[PDB]
Structure formats: structure tokens, C-alpha cells
Amino acid sequence: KQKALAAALGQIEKQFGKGSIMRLGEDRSMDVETISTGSLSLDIALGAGGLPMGRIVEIYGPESSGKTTLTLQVIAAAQREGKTCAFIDAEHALDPIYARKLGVDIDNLLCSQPDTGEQALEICDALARSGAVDVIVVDSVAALTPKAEIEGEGLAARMMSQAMRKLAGNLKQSNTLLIFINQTTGGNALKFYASVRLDIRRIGAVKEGENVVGSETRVKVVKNKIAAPFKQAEFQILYGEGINFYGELVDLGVKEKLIEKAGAWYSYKGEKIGQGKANATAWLKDNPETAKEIEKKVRELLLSNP
Amino acid sequence: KQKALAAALGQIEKQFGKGSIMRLGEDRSMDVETISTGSLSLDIALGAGGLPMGRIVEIYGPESSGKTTLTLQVIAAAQREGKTCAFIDAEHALDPIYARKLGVDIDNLLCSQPDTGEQALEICDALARSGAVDVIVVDSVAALTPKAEIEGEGLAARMMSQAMRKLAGNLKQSNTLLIFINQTTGGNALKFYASVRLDIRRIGAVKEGENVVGSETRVKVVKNKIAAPFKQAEFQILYGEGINFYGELVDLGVKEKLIEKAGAWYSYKGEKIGQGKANATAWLKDNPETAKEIEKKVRELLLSNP
Amino acid sequence: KQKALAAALGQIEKQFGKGSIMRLGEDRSMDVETISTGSLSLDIALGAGGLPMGRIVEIYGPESSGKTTLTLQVIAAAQREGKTCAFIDAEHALDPIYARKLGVDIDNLLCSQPDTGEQALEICDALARSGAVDVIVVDSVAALTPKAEIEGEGLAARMMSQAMRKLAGNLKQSNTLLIFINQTTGGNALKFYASVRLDIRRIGAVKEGENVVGSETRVKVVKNKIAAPFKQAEFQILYGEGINFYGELVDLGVKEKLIEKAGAWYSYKGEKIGQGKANATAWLKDNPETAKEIEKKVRELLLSNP
Amino acid sequence: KQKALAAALGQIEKQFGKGSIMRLGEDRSMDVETISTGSLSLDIALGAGGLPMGRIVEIYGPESSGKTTLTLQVIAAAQREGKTCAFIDAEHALDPIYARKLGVDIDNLLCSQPDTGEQALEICDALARSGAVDVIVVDSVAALTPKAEIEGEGLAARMMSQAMRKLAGNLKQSNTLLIFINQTTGGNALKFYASVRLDIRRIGAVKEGENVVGSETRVKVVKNKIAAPFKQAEFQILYGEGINFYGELVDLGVKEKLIEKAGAWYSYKGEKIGQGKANATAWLKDNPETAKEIEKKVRELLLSNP
Amino acid sequence: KQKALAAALGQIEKQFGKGSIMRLGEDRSMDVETISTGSLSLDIALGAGGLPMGRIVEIYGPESSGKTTLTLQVIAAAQREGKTCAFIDAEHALDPIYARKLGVDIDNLLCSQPDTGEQALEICDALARSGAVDVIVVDSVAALTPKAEIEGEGLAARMMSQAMRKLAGNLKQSNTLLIFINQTTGGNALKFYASVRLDIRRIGAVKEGENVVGSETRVKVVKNKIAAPFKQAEFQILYGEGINFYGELVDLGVKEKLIEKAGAWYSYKGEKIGQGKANATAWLKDNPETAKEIEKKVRELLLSNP
Amino acid sequence: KQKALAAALGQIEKQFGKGSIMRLGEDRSMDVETISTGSLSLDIALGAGGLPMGRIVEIYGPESSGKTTLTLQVIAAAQREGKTCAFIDAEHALDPIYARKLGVDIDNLLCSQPDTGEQALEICDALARSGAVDVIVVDSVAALTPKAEIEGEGLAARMMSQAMRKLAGNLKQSNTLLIFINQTTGGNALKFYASVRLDIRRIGAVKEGENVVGSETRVKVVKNKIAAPFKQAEFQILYGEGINFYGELVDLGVKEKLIEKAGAWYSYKGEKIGQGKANATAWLKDNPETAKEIEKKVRELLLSNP
């Protein structure tokens, strides 16, 4: 019965490798170093608690979907840990003012604005082989124009395929995380080589009465080779501020029974934290020590770990 | 006369096997274990009352045709019986929220997101040989990219042909049902190895006045080796709910004279069930015991059995 | 002069057989049992008044050319006479709803959906040898995939050639008519073994103002061994109805001076039948006895008989 | 000098036969009965004024090159003289509607659609021996499939070689002209046994502003044993009409100074015939007596006769 | 650590060239001759202190964004240095009155109003090859209509791509600066060949109470291959006057602690310059020697130089 | 030393005949009458200045290699001298229009289109014995089908061997030149009996910008018994014009220092002839007297004569 199945799946993983197959509800994950996305719900949706070092990740969605914010939050989180980041740009749209607001150390951010799509990929491969960079962000796949097209002479897909295998191997060896931002364009190479694929969309507005101050966002983990796929995350992205992390903390804290909200006050460990979600959120922001403890517990309860 | 024909067809079946030839109107079917599709009219169209264990089935149609819903309903029906299901995914589009609404036990659903089209087929074959899985769903044939294509080096058809014979044999031996979702692409291997091929399409909208709440669906059984082919099924797929099974039950109940609808009330066995099809449908939903009896009778009258 | 030629041709037929040579304008035909095509003009184009029992016939044309309709009309006409029909299918596209509208007795139609192109031909041969089937329809030559191709291992032509001689002999002996639907593919075997080859095409639309309700069709008898070849037929195929037989009857009736149309009314034997071709057509439909007599006369005047 | 050469060539012809050698510019031709090709320029290119009775002729070219039209015009010209024609068909593509437009008496045209390439040749030989047919047209060499090939068991070349010698001898004895249409395929037998070989091609379009109504055609007499070889002919083939004979008459009439075109009018024998080539052409068409006289003179001036 | 990174980046630059990658905060720049934009903040944003000779620059933005003013200020600055400028016009909108107010020497400005988009590019290439012109301004990309479009027969993108490579090479060789004004249209050729791309927009109005006398402008350096990209510049464009350079000088002087403004007076090197920013601005305008010294210091402190 | 060798070689020639052995660089040649090939460089490569009367020559190469042009130029050159030419054709591909453009007098060209390969050779032998023909061209060896093959009953080689000895003897006696065009096929008879064998190939295209107007040709004298073998010739064959003789004259004139080209003008004997090779070529074409003198000198300097 159970043994027969467990033994069968074992054979599958033995022949095809770890992560080749799993029950969507299992609390299993690869032992990979991760970098936070800046979103607690997304970190949980990823199972491993963040994006995996040494792998290829694809983040796609419509313009203004939030992929820009997400990408910058990842860079900021990485730099926070002392990790070196490189931005390979073919979009020419980085906003350093917004980036700094999200905590990005722009002064120390490495940047290249390649002459062709092929050159952009070659630079990524060189950086991957160097083992001197921790995170590489490519903005974006759709903008990586093949040299032949630029000169006005399927091509994009061919360009991606010819570089992906070597890139993936070099990234794994140096434990470098590479994120491809997309809108997906580029062919099947990225789709199959990616260890994680994120579908991000704006599903509504955040208002302060009549004034729109943010966006309701939803990210679906459509592909995940480090933990079970298909979980999703919903959170708010506030203009000029980024992901409303504390709002997520309150919601998850309440859902997991860590934060109580019956009666006139929300409370944690029996202590008052605020009247209403807003005040409770602001309180956690003003009390990092407690916020940190709640986050730790939420991760312990919801991450896909043994 | 009649004897001469019966004797001739017998020779055909003796030489070519059972199901090699039959009159489209005969009440004959193979003695195979089946899994419901979630649609009463389709189960009837299949003759045997559901999809056949141990065989290969192809379900194809345009995007949003309803093949997704149909596939999930099959998984849910199978799990309902305690059967183990595996989802081999190359589309990266499963929606667990909608799946749970259809009754799918996502937590216990096995899932693989293969690195190549060839790997996906090898995993299917391994699972088939293990005899530890009851239902395998492959989404989708069009997405099974050959390794050579992924690397940017007829190929898809060759990939399918090289695996089909062995896969079919292994599935039959372990009595594992495998469903290939398609849009058909892949060549002739699947077309000829499949025991059942379903053509599903959206033929209209279901409205509640001005608001669209569902789709009118039609499924044609274009190939059927377990019972007579070419029957069709029409039913509604309601957004967020799935196949309107009870609506089918009312329609078939009325057509088969089991449900009376003259006068002010619809009735069964002389008892009032509702005024109007809608109320009658809701009533059957609220009275499973009666609904179950009506379904049993409908199957007794319309399934292709001795 | 005339005698010298008649004597010469006689020698040709004596050495090579009846139908080996003839003047295209001669009123000669083989004494074969025939089945109507559902089209009066085509039955006339065939010279013998229909398709020949015991022979091989090829009907080819583009998709939506009308070959499907034509094939179903033949089956319906045959069943009308109490003849047994078998449908050997490798296309998986039969539409029983449309078939019933054309008069096909689907319930009594025998059907096989072979596993390979070779198996399909072997089943045809077995049925031919049994002498228990009157008409066999194969849909289609292009879809009869050789086993080697299905397994992904000139082949199609070889497959057809290896079976044709034996099939033709068995069909002749049991007086079974076999129709191969094609698009021609398959090699030269069918081309030379066929007693009749029909080229069917859609040459325009039939409209009711701005709405298209049918197709103008043209069938050319490119090969005919039962009567003189190369005659053609033009008729309409109306959606959901089939061949507009009565429209043909009116046209041929008028051309042969059987139906008068001068003045305000069309007439037959001096009796009013309608004002305008449309009304005259509807009238014949409402008066089968008169329609039957007109058809009989048209055949007497236009069929290639002594 | 001159005598030495004339005496030498005489010896060649004495040893090898008449037509074994000649100066390409000599006005010499065999005294053979001929049939017009329907083209004045081609009749002239042939030297003898038409195709030779009792000999084998090959007409080859791409599909739509005009060989079909040319072949039908020959049949029509022959029938015009009361000659009996036979069409041996393995292509199954004769269009009687177009044929009648070209003047072909379809009703009196003999036709055979042989079962094999060998049978087709045997029928040609039988007809040749009968002496009851004047013209035989074989469509086409490429379509004459050897029996062994049809049954799926160099062969075509062998088939042609085994029949050519006897066929040529029988045709000569009965003074029967045989034309092989080709695309050349079949080996060397036809190439060497043919008394005339024609290479026909479409070299452009004939337009009426923006609408294409015909084709500019060119025929090269690549082999000619009845008169000097290598002359060519250019003429137009108008859709639904055939060879623009009168257009050729005007061109040749003008080139030979028979038709004057200086000033405002074209003229013949001093009489106005039209303003512009088009009107002049139409005029000749409306005045057969004058057209006939001009053609007679053109032939007197350009045919290769003593 | 640091060495490992420095060595890695060195390899990148060695393989891909100088400027292929850099930290956004580094004080590095290419040793290129530059021309001032007329804006101190923009000159600083450019890192090198102005636009680069021998390269292609793109300046884009909405109508009335200020790109016109910026372009004219560049020409005026260039002419001030004795450099020869050419204006390639397809917009037909130059205002010489406003141009002269900005310091442009219209009388000596070369001008072409090309007949087609292709001709405009060919003239640019010819001028680039001549080495007789220092600055070329093209107004504008959107207005360069391909000849085929003009004649009413992707095309624009193809036109740009076919000329860009050769143009870039010729410009570099003669050290000619070329500026393409755009709104971006034209395809990817310009985007990748440009060494600098400027995004300019009007972000507000400048008022003198109730009267609007200018525009608040913002320029973002979205692409920069001569120094680190993404810096921005904000300044005012006053109607009939151009860029408020002295206003920028005061702001930057104050920000860099060069200009003191505590108490009742603004001061430099301890000397009073004015009460209020306006008076301080006017003072610098009236005292070029001091203004020049302050600008020199600001550049020393803010330009990206070793 | 030198004497010992000269005496030894003398013995060789005495025993085996003149031309049995020679130093490849010697200026020696047989005193045979020659006919120009139409190519100055080839005439020089032949050593004797043209093809030898009374001998057998083989010219072989791929289709479109230029052998056709070369062969026609030889005929034209011969006829120019009042010599009688005969064309023995088994290819049926002569183009009189192109031939006339090359200067061939088609009207006076003798032509035979033999019934078999054996007959073709017998006719060549008869013409050779007659002593009434100066040049015989056989097109081609590959097309000379043995009678046994034509009838479908090593053979070709045997056919050639049985005729070669007698043919060679008869040709020598009447001083008739015979050229066999080939593709080599036919066996060893021709290879050893030929006094000259030419290998001709197309080695590139001649363009007028983007339009191809000719072919770069190379002819290698692989066998030469009238002068030293192995020299080669390169020249252009222009479509519709033939060998670019004047282009060769300019090249050889320049190489031999006869034509000067330093400075702004090419010159001969100090007189300007043109600016650039093209104009210089056209000039020589317009000034035959000077061209003739230059050719005479080139031959005096480069032909292999005492």
C-alpha cells in the first residue's frame, strides 16, 4: 500500500533525480541557500523560504504587475546579506530613486547595458563562471534583441537555447542566482531550465478612501523544483514604499492563530498591539523584536521543511 | 442472412480482436474498470460509463474549451474512490484553487514538472511499470518539447512514437489509466494507440440575464475502442463550480420519462420536486438519495451494456 | 470504313477485355448492379446510373469539397435498399447527426477504427471475402498510417500495393463495393485498380441573399471503366440537408424539355407545378409520384444504356 | 569543292538513309502526310508543315506548359480532316469542356484507360497494327506505371524499350501517327525512335491590363527527322480559347512583308484591314478567305520544301 | 574578496570592452571630448560633463517636453567652441527666433530638409564620413518617413537598422556627435547603437504668481556608455530664455556647501551675494567670474572622474 | 651532362615518336594546322595556338561548365576560315539563337541526329573518310546509347573501343578535327586516342553589382600531344555573348608588359586607350587594328614555338 508507493517514487527520484516528483502537500524542500523576495507570503509559497542560489528563475507578468518591485526587493534583500548583485539591462528603465526607497544599495550595484541580446547572455555566463557575483538580474527577456534583428537581417528562441545549458551549468557551479524578468517570450529553453517560474499580476487597487496608494498583487509559483509548485501569494505593493511586509505578517499571524483579534484589541502572547489591523501593522513596524519572533514562528509553521 | 453476418463479424473479431468492429447501435462494451468524467452525458457517450483503466486516452480542444475542467473532474472522481493520481506537467498552469472547488485532493496529488518531453514520457512509463499509480494526466502533448528543440539543435512525432508502444503495454499490465491533454500535435502514435479520443469545445455561453456565468460545452467521442464510437455529450461548465451534473440529470431524467414535467410541477415517482428546471435541479442537489436513484436508472437505460 | 474500325476495336476488347476502349460518346455500359450517389447529375455522369457493386472506387478532393456528404449519401442509398454497409475509419471524424439528416441508419452501420493502415486493409479484405457486406467505405487513404511510421521506424504506397490485388479480387467475387476516400496519396495501386475515380470540388457558395446556406459542387468522373469517362456533374450541397436532388431534377427536366417554363408557370405534362425554379423544386418535393416519373424519364434519356 | 561535299553527303544518305544528315538551312523535307499542330509558327518550325503520319512524336514540358493544349489542337485538326483519333490515358485528366472549345469532337474520340503501363503500350501496338486509327495520343509517359511497380514488387525504361521497336514498325506500316506526352522519363528508347521531339514551355503571361488571360509559349523542335531540326515557335495560348493562330498570322504576315503596317492602317494587297495589331487580327478572323490566302503564302515562303 | 571581484570585472571588460560593466556609484568615465547640454545638472548626470563626440545620442520625450530647447542649447554650446553643426530636418519646425535667444548662430547653421527618411540617413552618413562637421542633429526619428511609405506602397525599423552600423562607424572615425530627437519609434537599432539615451519630460510649471513663465523639467539618463547610467537632472526652462543655468548653479552650490545661505544673506567665500535664491541667482549672472569658479568646483566635486 | 640527356630523349622520340616525351617548359610544338577556341588564354594553354586538325579532342565538364560555349566558338572560328563543320547530335539541345550570337553560321552547319550510338560513330567515320568535312563535333559521349541498350537487351566502352582506332586513322588522313563533348564516360579508348583533353569548369560568377551576367571559367589542358600539357586558362563567359576575348587580351597584354596601366590611363605604344580595365577593354573592341597587333605579339611571346 503506502510502502509500495513510497518505494516506487523512490525509484523515480533515483532515476530522474530529487524533485522529479512529489505530492503537492508534502513538507519537503531542497537544502539550497535562499534570498528573500521581500514578501513573506511569497517566501512561504516558494516552500524553501526564498529564491534559490545557483539556479535560474523566471519572473513574468504585464507591465506594472509588480515584477519590477519584486526584482528590486530581491536585490535589496541580497545586498542586506552582503551579497554582490549585477543588473544586466536591455530595458533602460531602472529607477534608482524608487530602488533606494526599497533598500537597494545603488552605488554598489553592478550594471551592464549590453549591445546585443547575445552579448547580454555572454556577460551573464562570464559573471556566472567568475564566481564573484551572487545575484544576476536580467531585464528583460523580451528586450534581448538578437544581433541579426538589430542589424535588420525563432531567432530569439534560438539565441536563448544556445546559451541556456552552459549558463545553467556555470550558475550552479558558482552558486549564483540568476533572475530573468519576462513578459512568455524567448522559447522553451528558459521554461525548462528554470528552477522557479513566477507569474505576477496586479489584481486590484489599494485605496485610502478615494486616493489610490497601492496595488493588490498576486504571485503564482507556476513552476518549482526546490519545493512543491503551485502555491500562491497575495500582498500589497504601496507606491513609493514597496511590498507591505507587515500587512502580510499581520494576516498570516492572525490566520495561524499567533495573533489574536477578538474583542477591542489585537494581541500577541497576551499583550495589546493595536485596535484594528492598521494600528496592529504599525505596531509591529515599531516593534521589530516582536515582529521578528512572529515571522520566525510563521515560517516554522508554513515553510515546506522536514 | 443474420447468421451469415454474425458469423462473419465473429471471424473479424477472432482475427483482429474484440472491438475491431461493431454496429454503432449495439449495446456492447468491454468489461473494463472505469472512472467517471464528472459528466453524466459523457459517461453515457463513452458507453462503458466512464474512462477505461489501463488504457491511453486523448482529450483535445481549444484553450478554454473545458478540457482543463474535464481533466480535473476525472482526477477528483478517481481520488474519491481512493485511487492514486499523478499529474505530469509541462504547461505550468494548474490552478489548485479551482481544482479544490472541483473536489480535487491537491495535497495528495503527485506532480512532476519534467525537464524535457522525453523525460516526461520516461516518467510516465516508470510510473506505469510501478503499478503504484491509478491515473496519470499529462498536460500537455503540445508542451512536451523534445530535448533537441530545447537546446535549439517531425521531432515531436518521433519522440511520441518511440515511447507509445512501451507505454501502452506497461499501462495495460498495471491497469493504469493515462490521459494526454492536447490541442492534434504529436503525430499518429497517440491517435492509433489511444482507446478513447475526446473532442471538446465551448459552443456557447450560460447567462443569468446579462451576466455570463458559464459555458455550454460539447464533447464528441471521436474514437472509442471500449464501446461504440461517435456519441456526443452536451453539458454546462459553470465558472468556479465545474460541470453542472444535476442539470444533466434533470435533462436525461426528463428525456427518459423518469422525471415528469407536465402541469405546474416536475415530479419523480409521483412526488413534487420543483417548479421549473432550475428548482428541480436544486432539489436533486438537496436530495442525493433520489438523485442517486435517478442516475442509476438513467445509466441502466442508456449505458451500452448487455 | 466503319466495319474496319468496329472489327479492330472488337479485337482490342477481345484481347484486353470489355471496357478496354470505347468512343466517349457511345451509349454503352457494363451490366453491373449500382448504388445511387444521391445526385442525379452524378448518377448520369457515371453512365451506369450509380456506383458499381464489386468494384473499387476512389473519391478525392479538398477538405469541405463535399466528399463526406457524397460518401454518406451513398451509404444512405445503399441502406435504403437493405444493403449492409461498413465504415472503416482512420480519420475519427464521422458526424452521426449530419449522417442521420442525410438518411443514414447509423444504428445499423458497421464500424471499425483500425490500429494501423495495414490492419485497416486486412479488415477490408476479410469483409470482402466474407460476402456478408455490400458496401465498404474507407476514410481515408491519407490517414492509413503504416505500422512502421506509427512506431517511428514510399511506405504508404508499398502498403497499398501489397493489398490492392487481393482486395480487388475478393471484392469482385463477393460483389462488394468499396470506396476509398482520398485527398492522390497512396501511390499508383489504387489509381489503376479503381473502376471509377471521382474528383469533387466546391466551386462556389449558395446564398439566400447575404446568408450562405450551401455550396456549389462539381464532380468530374476522371476514370470510368463501367461506362465512358470524363463526364461531370454540378449540383448544390445544402448545409444540414445534403445534395439538392430536386434542384437537379428541375434543371435536367428543363434541359431535356420534360419540364416547360415559358410564360408565368413551369409545367409538366401540361400541369402547373410552380412559378419560378424554387417553387417548382418544392412542388416536386411535395409530389414524389410526379418527381419519380420525371427522374425515370431523365435516366432513360441520359444514361449510357443500349 | 561543292561537288565533293554533295557527293560525300550523298554517300552518307545512301548508307544511313534519307534524313541521316543535312545542312540546317536547307529547304528539304520528307514527303510525309502531316497534321497541323494548330500553330502556324510551329507548323513552319517543323519544316514539313505539321506532325508526320506514321511516325512517333514526343512532346514534353512542365505542367501548364501548353502541351495539353497543343495535343488537343492536333486531335482537333486531325478530326477536321475526317481522321480517327484514339486517346490512351494514364493521367485521368482530360477536360472535355476545354477540348470542345478547341474544336475536338469528344463524342467520336476513342479512349482507353489501361490497367498498367505495359497494357497501355500493347493497346497502342494493337491499334497501330489494325490500320484503323490515324492518330494515337498517349498521356503520358511518366504515368505509364510498370505492372511490377503497381504491385509494389530502370523498370520503366525497360518497359519502353521492349515495346518501341515493334510499335514504331507497326505505326509506319499503317501510317499511324503516335504522340507521347512527357515531362525526359522513360529512358532512351523514345528519344531515339521519335521522328520529332518538341520542347514546350510557358515563357510569360498575356495580359489585358491587369488581368491575365493567356500565356506566352515557346516550342523548340529539338529533334526532327522529317526536316531540319532546331527551329522554334512562339505564340500565345489564351485561356478557354487555345492557340492564338490569327495573332501568329499577323506577325508572320508582317515579317514576310505580306501585311503592311506603316501609317494609320495595316493592309493586305492594298486594302485596309485594321488600325493596330489587335484590330488587324480580329479582321483576319472575320475574313477567312483573305486569312487563308495569307497563310498559304506564308507557308509557301517559310516551309522547308523544294 | 575585493580582489576576486576586481579581477573578474577586468576579465569582463577585457572580453567585452570598456564600459561593458561598472558599479553605478564609481567615479569612472571615458576620456571623450564633450559638448555641454546647457544644463549643469544634466552635464553632471552624464558623468563625463556633457554629450560625447563621435557617438550617437538619442533624446526623446513628449512634445513640449523640452527636447527642442535641449537640442538647441547643445548646438549653441558647440558653436561657442567654434564647432560646425548641421541640422537634418524632417519636422519643418525650427524656430530661429527662439534659437537665437538661446545663443544659436543660425546664419552659420548647416541645414538639410531631405526628401525621404533614407535620404536623411544617407546625408548623415556622408557628413559623418567627411569629417568636416562636429555635431549633427536629426529632427526627428518619427518624421523620417521611408520612401515606400511616402509613395503609399516594420519599414521604419528596417530603414534605421540598415543604416545604423555604418553611420556609427563613420561618426566614431571622424569624432562627429550625432543626436537623434525622438518621441521610442524606429526599432532597436538606435536603442543599442546609442552611447547615451535621454528621457526628458515636463514635470510642472514655473510661475511668477499667477503667470506661467516656464516649465519644471526632468531628464533621466536611461542609457550611458561613457559613464554610469541612471542619474537624473531637474532644472527649469524659461519661455524665451532657455535653461535656467544660474538657478541650477545656486541649487548645486548650496547642496555642495559651496554657497552658504544661513541668516539674512547667501554668501560665497564669505562675501554677500544676495538675499533669497532669486537675488543670489541674479548676482551670479552679474558676476561671471565668481559663477565660473563655483561651476568649476561643482564639476570637480560631482563629475564622474578619477 | 646536357648532351647525354638530349641524346637519350632523342632515342625515346625515335622509338616512340615525336611528342612521346618533353620537358613541360620547352617551347616546342607540332606543325599542325589549328583552329582557335575563341579564347586567347586557352589558345596559349594549348601551346600550338588552337585545336589540331586531323586529331581527336575531348572536352569534358559539368553541365553549364562552358563546354557548350567553347564548342560553338570553335565551330564559329572554323567557319570564319571557310571550313566545313558537322554536328553529330545525340543530346538534342543545340540553341541556334545563342549559336548565331557566337558567330556560328547555322544555315551552313551540317547536322545528324543518329538513331544509335553505333550509327553516330559510323557517320563520323564516313565523314572522316570523305575528306569533305573539316570539323566534326559530337554531342555527346554520354548520350551515345548503344543499340543493345536502346532495345533494352561495359557496352558503351566496347562501342567506343571498336570504332576509335579506325576513326582516328581516317581523321588523320583527311586532316579532319573531331571533338567529343563529354561529362569521363565511354571507357579508355577516347582517353588514349585523344591528342588533346580539356577539363572545363565554372569557378565563379561575373556580376554587374548584384546582377549575375556571366561565369568565371577555367580550362585545364590535362592531355596534350601537340605541345606540353597541363597549362590552364581562365576567362569569362558572358551570357548571350560568349567568351570575353578582349578581357583576356587586356589581362595578357598587361601581364606581358605590352599594355601599361600606371597613372590615370592604360596605354599601348604610349597612346591612351582607357581609364580602368573596362574602358580599356571596350577601346580594344572599338579598335580592331590595335587589338590585332597586341594579340599577335602576345602569341609571339607565349605560344610554344621555336
Ligand SMILES: [Ca+2]
Ligand atoms: Ca562566489
Ligand SMILES: [Ca+2]
Ligand atoms: Ca487583504
Ligand SMILES: [Ca+2]
Ligand atoms: Ca483581544
Ligand SMILES: [Ca+2]
Ligand atoms: Ca496497482
Ligand SMILES: [Ca+2]
Ligand atoms: Ca440546455
Ligand SMILES: [Ca+2]
Ligand atoms: Ca407534474
Ligand SMILES: [Ca+2]
Ligand atoms: Ca453477399
Ligand SMILES: [Ca+2]
Ligand atoms: Ca445552378
Ligand SMILES: [Ca+2]
Ligand atoms: Ca408555362
Ligand SMILES: [Ca+2]
Ligand atoms: Ca488506315
Ligand SMILES: [Ca+2]
Ligand atoms: Ca508577341
Ligand SMILES: [Ca+2]
Ligand atoms: Ca498602311
Ligand SMILES: [Ca+2]
Ligand atoms: Ca573633423
Ligand SMILES: [Ca+2]
Ligand atoms: Ca526647484
Ligand SMILES: [Ca+2]
Ligand atoms: Ca549668510
Ligand SMILES: [Ca+2]
Ligand atoms: Ca578535305
